[PDB]
Chains A and B, each alone.
Chain A
Amino acid sequence: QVQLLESGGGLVQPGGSLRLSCAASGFTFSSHGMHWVRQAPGKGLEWVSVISGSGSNTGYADSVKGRFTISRDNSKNTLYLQMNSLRAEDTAVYYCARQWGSYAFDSWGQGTLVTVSSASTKGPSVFPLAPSSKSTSGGTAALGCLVKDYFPEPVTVSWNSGALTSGVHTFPAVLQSSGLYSLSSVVTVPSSSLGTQTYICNVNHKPSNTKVDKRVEPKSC
């Protein structure tokens, strides 16, 4: 039913500009106040901006006033957030949210990450974490993928194009001293399936347009 689909996030340099969008469906769009709420990595919720159903009445938090502009296209059922004069402190996951009553938020988008940095986009190197003859601790074996040296966040990892979900652990990225990110995605599978089943990690780093499908095979030594 009620859906809020976001787009537009990514890397932008300090002093830069970026536009976010929020496509709405499943409800009368023009009947709701629409908002932007952000969450800096590992931090709390910060309300950013409001716009009335008509699109005539707008509001801003003091932190974004004069730099950001909220708008809506009711014919296209789309909410926008035009960000300008972007600062390091603007780096957050930005959510669009539908107003419920007196400014509570009942439906939210999936979020879009906005990274404000002078550093360049770097695609990741994808290496296998092969299941060994020793790693077969009984009947359960572990295998994975190492997604190394990328910038900025985020990366997405799926196994066998979404077919494999159970036993999967995609770890939070770690920032290395090189200013580059590194994460690992692992899956525990039965040792008895290594000869029969193919294991491929589908790595996607949208900022650099990197799409890697790495086949994880037990090493022949």
Chain B
Amino acid sequence: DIQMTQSPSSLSASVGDRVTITCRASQSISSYLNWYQQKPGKAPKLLIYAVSTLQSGVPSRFSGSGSGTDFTLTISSLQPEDFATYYCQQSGTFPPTTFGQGTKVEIKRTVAAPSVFIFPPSDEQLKSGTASVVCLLNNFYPREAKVQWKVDNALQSGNSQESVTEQDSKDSTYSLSSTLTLSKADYEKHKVYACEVTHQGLSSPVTKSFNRGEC
């Protein structure tokens, strides 16, 4: 099959920037090269048809060019709403049709420190033999954050799983959820459960904690 390769695979840019997404074909293709915008949790939306045809309701800041093996999608003035993964598609020697691997576009924004919250295991969960301790890092930028679990001030490892949301549509921040999983037995063995957060927005780490039992 004809292989479509996009560059870069990921990009971060500022509002007002002229951003370019490249699409290279493994062989020369005619003019049936189309561009898609896929927002998280949504189906792709067709932006550009046959190299350069702008679709209805697509802002004129989106434009396409290229020929042979090299194609470009240009966003002339990047907007916060342009956050998505972009795909190129060749459809001129059909069947089959092949797509590029995707280019995730991230919106650059001012530094925002997270709001840190700690959740003790519920009593309903403890009654079943497991203890899940949840730490929330809410609405921060940039994505890079360091979450450290400490049980009686001793750093934990291998007993936690992080999960990060996609860029917020309204403020371009991320949120993160870290879960510390322990047996009821190991949980009953210690007293202070701390979640320590390191981030560009914090002058010094932020620790949120609770003592098991007492409130």
A touches B (Cβ under 8 A): yes
Q: Are A137 and B117 in contact (CB under 8 A)?
A: yes
- Whether A44 contacts B102 in the complex (CB less than 8 A), given A103-B94, A105-B44, A106-B46, comes out as yes
Residue with the greatest number of chain B CB neighbours at <10 A, chosen from A60, A108, A173: A108
Q: Counting CB contacts under 8 A, is B172 at the interface? A: no
Q: Counting CB contacts under 8 A, is B72 at the interface? A: no
The size bracket of the interface on A is: 35 or more
Nearest A-chain residue to B4, judged by Cβ:
A44
Interface-lining segment among B13-21, B122-130, B141-149: B122-130
CB neighbours (8 Å) of B214 from chain A are 221
Q: Are A129 and B32 in contact (CB under 8 A)?
A: no
Main secondary structure of the interface of B (DSSP, over half): strand
State A105–B100 Cα separation when bound (angstroms). Answer: 15
Q: Are A135 and B117 in contact (CB under 8 A)?
A: yes
Q: Are A188 and B46 in contact (CB under 8 A)?
A: no
Nearest B-chain residue to A45, judged by Cβ:
B99
CB neighbours (8 Å) of A169 from chain B are 138, 165, 175, 177
- Which residue of the partner chain, among B46, B102, B125, B175, contacts A104 with CB atoms under 8 Å? B46
Q: Counting CB contacts under 8 A, is A59 at the interface? A: yes
Q: Counting CB contacts under 8 A, is B101 at the interface? A: yes
Q: Counting CB contacts under 8 A, is B92 at the interface? A: yes
CB neighbours (8 Å) of B161 from chain A are 174, 176, 182
- Which residue of the partner chain, among B96, B99, B163, B175, contacts A183 with CB atoms under 8 Å? B163
A219 to chain B, nearest CB (A): 7
Q: Counting CB contacts under 8 A, is A50 at the interface? A: yes
Q: Counting CB contacts under 8 A, is B154 at the interface? A: no
Q: Counting CB contacts under 8 A, is B132 at the interface? A: yes
Q: Counting CB contacts under 8 A, is B67 at the interface? A: no
Nearest A-chain residue to B92, judged by Cβ:
A102
Q: Counting CB contacts under 8 A, is A23 at the interface? A: no
A: which residues have CB within 8 A of B?
44-47, 50, 59-62, 95, 100-106, 108-111, 125, 127-130, 132-135, 137, 140, 142, 144, 146, 148, 169, 171-174, 176, 182-184, 186, 188, 219, 221
List 13 extra interface pairs beyond A45-B87, A110-B43, A146-B132, CB under 8 A.
A44-B99, A50-B95, A62-B1, A102-B32, A104-B46, A105-B44, A135-B117, A144-B134, A144-B136, A146-B134, A172-B165, A183-B163, A186-B177
**12 interchain pairs, CB-CB under 8 A:** A101-B49, A102-B91, A102-B94, A104-B50, A132-B215, A169-B165, A169-B175, A169-B177, A171-B165, A174-B162, A174-B163, A184-B179
The 8 closest A-B pairs by CB, nearest first: A108-B43, A103-B91, A221-B215, A59-B95, A45-B99, A104-B34, A129-B119, A171-B163
B: which residues have CB within 8 A of A?
1, 32, 34, 36, 43-46, 49-50, 55, 87, 89, 91-92, 94-102, 115, 117-122, 124-125, 128, 132, 134, 136, 138, 161-165, 175, 177, 179, 181, 210, 214-215
